[PDB]
Ligand binder design. Structure first.
Ligand SMILES: [Mg+2]
Ligand SMILES: [Mg+2]
Ligand SMILES: [Mg+2]
Ligand SMILES: [Mg+2]
Ligand SMILES: [Mg+2]
Ligand SMILES: [Mg+2]
Ligand SMILES: [Mg+2]
Ligand SMILES: [Mg+2]
Ligand SMILES: [Mg+2]
Ligand SMILES: [Mg+2]
Ligand SMILES: [Mg+2]
Ligand SMILES: [Mg+2]
Ligand SMILES: [Mg+2]
Ligand SMILES: [Mg+2]
Ligand SMILES: [Mg+2]
Ligand SMILES: [Mg+2]
Ligand SMILES: [Mg+2]
Ligand SMILES: [Mg+2]
Ligand SMILES: [Mg+2]
Ligand SMILES: [Mg+2]
Ligand SMILES: [Mg+2]
Ligand SMILES: [Mg+2]
Ligand SMILES: [Mg+2]
Ligand SMILES: [Mg+2]
Ligand SMILES: [Mg+2]
Ligand SMILES: [Mg+2]
Ligand SMILES: [Mg+2]
Ligand SMILES: [Mg+2]
Ligand SMILES: [Mg+2]
Ligand SMILES: [Mg+2]
Ligand SMILES: [Mg+2]
Ligand SMILES: [Mg+2]
Ligand SMILES: [Mg+2]
Ligand SMILES: [Mg+2]
Ligand SMILES: [Mg+2]
Ligand SMILES: [Mg+2]
Ligand SMILES: [Mg+2]
Ligand SMILES: [Mg+2]
Ligand SMILES: [Mg+2]
Ligand SMILES: [Mg+2]
Ligand SMILES: [Mg+2]
Ligand SMILES: [Mg+2]
Ligand SMILES: [Mg+2]
Ligand SMILES: [Mg+2]
Ligand SMILES: [Mg+2]
Ligand SMILES: [Mg+2]
Ligand SMILES: [Mg+2]
Ligand SMILES: [Mg+2]
Ligand SMILES: [Mg+2]
Ligand SMILES: [Mg+2]
Ligand SMILES: [Mg+2]
Ligand SMILES: [Mg+2]
Ligand SMILES: [Mg+2]
Ligand SMILES: [Mg+2]
Lengths: 208, 135
RNA sequence: CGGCCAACUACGUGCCAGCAGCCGCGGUAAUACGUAGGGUCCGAGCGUUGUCCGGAAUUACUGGGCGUAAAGAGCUCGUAGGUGGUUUGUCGCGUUGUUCGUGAAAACUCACAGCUUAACUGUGGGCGUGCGGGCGAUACGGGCAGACUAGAGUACUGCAGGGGAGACUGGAAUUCCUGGUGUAGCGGUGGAAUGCGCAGAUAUCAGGAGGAACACCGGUGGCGAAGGCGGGUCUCUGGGCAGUAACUGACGCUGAGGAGCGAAAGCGUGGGGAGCGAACAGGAUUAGAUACCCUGGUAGUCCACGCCGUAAACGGUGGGUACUAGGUGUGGGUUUCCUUCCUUGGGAUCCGUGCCGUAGCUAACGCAUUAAGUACCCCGCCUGGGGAGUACGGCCGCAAGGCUAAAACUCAAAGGAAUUGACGGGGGCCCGCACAAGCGGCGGAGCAUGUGGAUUAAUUCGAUGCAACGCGAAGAACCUUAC
RNA sequence: AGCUCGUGUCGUGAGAUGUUGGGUUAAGUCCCGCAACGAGCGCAACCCUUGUCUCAUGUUGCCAGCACGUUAUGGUGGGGACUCGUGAGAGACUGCCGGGGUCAACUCGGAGGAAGGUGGGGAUGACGUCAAGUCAUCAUGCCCCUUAUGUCCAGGGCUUCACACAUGCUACAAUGGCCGGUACAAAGGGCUGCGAUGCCGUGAGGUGGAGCGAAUCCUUUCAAAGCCGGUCUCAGUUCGGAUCGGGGUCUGCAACUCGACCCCGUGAAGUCGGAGUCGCUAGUAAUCGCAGAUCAGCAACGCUGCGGUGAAUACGUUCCCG
RNA sequence: GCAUUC
């Protein structure tokens, strides 16, 4: 357990909470609902490519912002998917929700989405070295990215002995608190088990 | 001042150090000093210090030289060896202890006295001067 | 149908049943086992076993090696043999040209023909490398008859040396003996004890005896074929080097067998025996201690004359000869200059002995004019590791044993050099409550808590050197809870 | 404090160099060289907390200077002045001075300052290692069960006990025990929860419920060690408080197995612990209480944290461990 | 001084 989660390490300084509310008495109930919402969302738009979910609460208003690579599949042109999700949302939550389905500017700068892309290639029996190098090159071309690291571990290539390989390009200063490190993790599903993909994308320094 | 091993055969690498020298100097031409804490102010200023002492007469170079003139084949063995590996003609003053097979155009003479040094340096310099004028 | 080596997946057993030429595949997910589907190579054949050649430059004539991988005899001398500097003439044996005879047929090979094609068959060339006869050439090898001096040897004049042998002889020191002086310790180790003393030791002084080795000089220096050789003197005696070319005129080199020499230990007979010291005793150490350490101590170590014939007898490098950058020490001679003529002044030259470095060589390490480089002549030796330098036979020896020298069987290696790590009761340099300096605890008692063990119908499961054990449990009466 | 890469260069090659050497640092920290030239992950810094000051601001916090009350208190009118709370900012840089030094890194000392030399302490664990741990948080490949290896319930067990190990707590006392008086904290918690006064019980507690979603009220006006006084007098005791008998309280549907607490009685071992072994370098060790999470209740002497009182010693690197 | 084994 050698590496502190990059997001949590910077949570007070360089990154921000993925949910905004205040409650004293309702805190436990709010968390329970959040758990339910995020499990309902993480297992719905899997092939849509979700990076972030932000949940805002106040009175009964439940604002859910879903960041996605392409919103096309997250909203049918008839609103079909928005209506289906809002239906299950309000049902579960008990109150009224406003899905603000957004979209990500630079998909290939987004560590969670880069992790999903590597994972899906491994799910489609792509040589893991290929997927690693592809993600590295795509990310480094984009203007903010000053460095990237990608790590895949598990039964790589279907072998019986676990391997943990990593490729790195540029700077990835994990120990620097002011360094803006974007972290993503995704679990690729394969005939021989699960292989974990971690991505660290350094995008520069924040002073506040 | 000092021949950095690889100045010729590793030209693409030392060419980056040249970019960094110009970056640092140009940031100063505008004013990158007295901006931060002494600590940083000096750290940046300690780079130009060394970079110029070793690359001052190279800042102009953009490609490996077409020919190399050397004053002491033995004390400059690395420089001569790099030139011969790139097939760059070496012209050099050979004293009795130098090896005449490494050097294409050998001018016999004392490599150790400042008088004979300055003499032949200026001779080959005037040759270059006449070539530039006759260009 | 793993890689060689063309051709892959599923199911069935899971270190079993089995596969396999080699490396290797089978341990409940096998492209290697068995079956099936598919594939590949061959086809009236396809595989397997046996046998020979190839790959194997792995007995190397073409075509290999011997510093450290397997391999230079311990070192010389010399027999047979192999090999041969310069030059004149001659023979025509080797060599070479040509011609004739022969080299049966078949086969082989080229052509052409005949079976429908082919296999097969036939015809005509070539092949049949050889051998014999005649005739031609004479560069090279050889024979024969001469010449020459550069190799080899001799002579003469100098020179350095622990080269060898014999005899005599010198001093220091150890031991013992005799006698003073003088006491109670001495001796020994990491620490002790056996031991020697108190019956007069050790220590100190004087005298005597006797044996062995020769401090300083004395060195990575000299001499010797190697083994080896160091106190001095004398006697006898071997080799080397330089100078001079006086002399002989290829007389040279190497050498299977053979002969001689050959450290130390050992053996025989006779002497000697101070010190040292296998064996042998005690003491100590240790679990033991047939050892290392201590106290003693016999063969032996020494001499005379024999025997033995081995050593990491090593430069782990056979001998002779020529050639291939230099630099720098040192030993033995010659000579030219600078000149005081001081002289380690400097040069040239010949012969040794070291170090460092080119070219070239080498797997690398390294070698490098003192080759492991470039070449020629002769000898010895190697052919995977073990079994084994053993057995048997034989020769030699007083004996110990030496020399010559297998096979069965067994392994898929055994090796050389170098590299990165790790490790060391290796080194250097630094750290940490590591020790030291301190203060307070634990191991003893009672109780709480976890665990092992034992119980139990169940005492749910997990953790279980450091890094499990008041740990998962931040809460086991029911619930929790898995028993 | 190390672990590596790119491009050069050296080697037939594995590799080497860089990363060695000299100096220096807590540090592969930096300097000087240097066939190497650069770069990356580690180091350091950025973040939190503690120590000083400045500016902004006064309720629920503070009370100096003015009014009004106490039989009690900032209690109350009020006041920005001191604290304090929380926002922004300054400050430490070997920056300055003297001597060491390669006119280098860096070093020894001095001034100033709350602080001096990474000020003290958190957070932060490089490339890897141990086929370390966890299929019992969760997830998951494959295998197995599906009238059970799923699932509901009552009772029992996880609490056994001839022993052994490990981590703790309480002791063996006078630097103490007991009784009386009296002083000084920080941090934190509270809604079918924390609960004040009064009254009733020896006490655990009962009754009843003020006031607080809290800088307000409750957790006493919040501690214990401490300080003053008295008593015991070296005794297995007025030390110790295990065990066991009786009588109770509270939570809970229910305290037999198997809860905590209270009162009366009882009064065990234990006289400072063998070989051996553990922690700690200053607000540390030692010692004293307080709070929190889990939680109806608690096996809490555990764990996480908070303040009070406060030492001794470090010549030094010969020896043991890493 | 002593320090065997896996
Ligand atoms: Mg194939
Ligand atoms: Mg052959
Ligand atoms: Mg064969
Ligand atoms: Mg060979
Ligand atoms: Mg040879
Ligand atoms: Mg050998
Ligand atoms: Mg020899
Ligand atoms: Mg002869
Ligand atoms: Mg001849
Ligand atoms: Mg002859
Ligand atoms: Mg015939
Ligand atoms: Mg004699
Ligand atoms: Mg006497
Ligand atoms: Mg005496
Ligand atoms: Mg001979
Ligand atoms: Mg012979
Ligand atoms: Mg002898
Ligand atoms: Mg005998
Ligand atoms: Mg004898
Ligand atoms: Mg005798
Ligand atoms: Mg002895
Ligand atoms: Mg003899
Ligand atoms: Mg021998
Ligand atoms: Mg010898
Ligand atoms: Mg030999
Ligand atoms: Mg030779
Ligand atoms: Mg010589
Ligand atoms: Mg050499
Ligand atoms: Mg060789
Ligand atoms: Mg053998
Ligand atoms: Mg024999
Ligand atoms: Mg025999
Ligand atoms: Mg100690
Ligand atoms: Mg105990
Ligand atoms: Mg105790
Ligand atoms: Mg258990
Ligand atoms: Mg603990
Ligand atoms: Mg139960
Ligand atoms: Mg290295
Ligand atoms: Mg290193
Ligand atoms: Mg360096
Ligand atoms: Mg660094
Ligand atoms: Mg850090
Ligand atoms: Mg394991
Ligand atoms: Mg399961
Ligand atoms: Mg039950
Ligand atoms: Mg338990
Ligand atoms: Mg008492
Ligand atoms: Mg007692
Ligand atoms: Mg007492
Ligand atoms: Mg410390
Ligand atoms: Mg509780
Ligand atoms: Mg405390
Ligand atoms: Mg044994």
């Amino acid at each position: 357990g050698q590496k502190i989660n990059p997001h949590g390490f910077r949570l007070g300084i360089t990154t921000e909470w993925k949910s905004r509310w205040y409650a004293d008495k309702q805190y436990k109930d709010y968390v329970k609902e959040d758990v339910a919402i995020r499990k309902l969302l993480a297992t719905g738009l899997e092939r849509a490519g979700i990076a972030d979910v932000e949940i805002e609460r106040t009175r009964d208003r439940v604002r859910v912002d879903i960041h996605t690579a392409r919103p096309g599949i997250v909203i049918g042109r008839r609103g079909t998917e928005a209506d289906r999700i809002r239906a299950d949302l309000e049902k579960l939550t008990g109150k009224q929700v406003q899905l603000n389905i957004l979209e990500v500017k630079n998909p290939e700068s987004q560590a969670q989405l880069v992790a999903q892309g590597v994972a899906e290639q491994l799910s489609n029996r792509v040589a893991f070295r290929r997927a690693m190098r592809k993600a590295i090159q795509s990310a480094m071309r984009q203007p903010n990215v000053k460095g990237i690291r990608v790590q895949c571990s598990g039964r790589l290539g279907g072998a019986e002995m676990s391997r943990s390989e990593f490729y790195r390009e540029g700077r990835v200063p994990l120990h620097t608190l002011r360094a803006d490190i974007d972290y993503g993790l995704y679990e690729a599903k394969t005939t021989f088990g699960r292989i974990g993909v971690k991505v660290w994308i350094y995008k520069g320094d924040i002073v506040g | 001042q000092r021949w950095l091993g690889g100045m010729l055969t590793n030209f693409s690498t030392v060419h980056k150090r040249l970019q960094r020298l110009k970056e640092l100097e140009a940031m100063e031409q505008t004013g990158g000093f007295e901006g931060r804490t002494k600590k940083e102010i000096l750290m940046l200023t300690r780079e130009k210090n060394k970079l110029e002492r070793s690359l001052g007469g190279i800042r102009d170079m953009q490609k490996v030289p077409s020919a190399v003139w050397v004053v002491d084949t033995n004390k400059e063995h690395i420089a001569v060896g790099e030139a011969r590996k790139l097939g760059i003609p070496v012209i050099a003053i050979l004293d009795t202890n130098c090896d005449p097979d490494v050097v294409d155009y050998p001018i016999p003479g004392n490599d150790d006295a400042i008088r004979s040094a300055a003499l032949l340096t200026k001779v080959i310099a005037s040759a270059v001067a006449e070539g530039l004028q006759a260009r």
